[PDB]
């Protein structure tokens, strides 16, 4: 079971719904660090995100989460965290003020193989509210 | 129609008609006697071409 966890950690992601706080912005670019509050979902380290309202733009993945000087890998609903977003290699980096603002909503860049791997194996670790969020992201991301 | 990957549609939709009771067929030596009689004994001379033993046209 833990061998399958270490095998399937990098290709299976968790649903996520991040709302960025105004004025709690702690970097500009590379890494893109700010303090965000978990509106919904559970965040996993290494999960990529994409903004739906700005024509499906990807900013990066998670490298470290700091919750009041604590290294907390997975955060639950309603906990204020600080994430350290590092952009993907090869693509151009993103900075504040022109691609994203302080009023957008961040959600995890989920993929069809990741819903398939969550339903095939991770069903015992899946909650109904996060499954509803997964259905919502399937309705949002043009995922048929 | 239902589906295409279903198997035995023709066998599962065949109008099942049971066999009817018939008299038993002679076997062993008497069948050769009846075949010899019906093929060489009570035949009429015929012109043209000879019809088969099942030509029900």
């Amino acid at each position: 079971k833990k061998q399958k966890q270490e095998e399937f950690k990098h290709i299976a992601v968790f649903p996520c719904k991040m709302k960025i706080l105004p004025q709690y912005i702690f970097n500009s670019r590379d890494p893109i660090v700010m303090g965000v509050t978990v509106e919904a979902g559970q965040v996993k380290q290494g999960t990529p995100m994409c903004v739906p309202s700005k024509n499906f733009v990807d900013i990066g993945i998670v490298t470290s989460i700091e919750v009041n000087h604590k290294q907390v890998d997975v955060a639950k609903k309603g906990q204020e965290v600080c994430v350290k977003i590092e952009p993907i290699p090869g693509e151009s980096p993103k900075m504040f003020g022109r691609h994203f603002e302080a009023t957008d909503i961040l959600v995890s860049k989920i993929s069809r193989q990741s819903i398939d791997a969550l339903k095939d194996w991770f069903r015992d670790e899946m909650q109904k509210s996060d499954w509803q969020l997964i259905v919502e992201l399937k309705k949002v991301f043009e995922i048929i | 129609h239902g589906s295409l990957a279903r198997v035995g549609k023709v066998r599962g939709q065949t109008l099942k008609v049971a066999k009817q009771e018939k008299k038993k067929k002679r076997t062993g030596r008497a069948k050769r006697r009846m075949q010899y009689n019906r093929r060489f004994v009570n035949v009429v001379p015929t012109f043209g071409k000879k019809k088969g033993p099942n030509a029900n046209s």
């Binding site: 399937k138 309705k139 995922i143 048929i144 | 239902g2 589906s3 295409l4 990957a5």
Partner: protein, 99 residues
């Protein structure tokens, strides 16, 4: 001509790649991919383009390769959309014949 409905063992599909050798791949309504192998009565008389609603049967022993049954025109496709047999996620993206 007539409004054919589905049955237990068949579903609808949308073409992703129009491929050769008499085969293609189309999604289901939930996104599972079934390798569509075209029916023998639909090889030359009708022509299947890309991103159109079709009728594709399923298999009761495996999930690796499916078969196409029928095709629908654009007006009956948006009429079937107006009834609501599919969720509010799929968009036809204006496919029809030219003039």
């Amino acid at each position: 001509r007539e409004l054919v409905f589905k049955e237990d063992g068949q579903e609808y599909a949308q073409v992703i790649k129009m491929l050769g050798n008499g085969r293609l791949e189309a999604m289901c309504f939930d996104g599972v991919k079934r390798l569509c192998h075209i029916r023998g009565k639909l090889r030359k008389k009708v022509w299947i383009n890309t991103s159109d609603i079709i009728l594709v049967g399923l298999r009761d022993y495996q999930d690796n390769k499916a078969d196409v049954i029928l095709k629908y025109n654009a007006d009956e496709a948006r009429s079937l959309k107006a009834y609501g047999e599919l969720p509010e996620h799929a968009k036809i993206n204006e496919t029809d014949t030219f003039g």
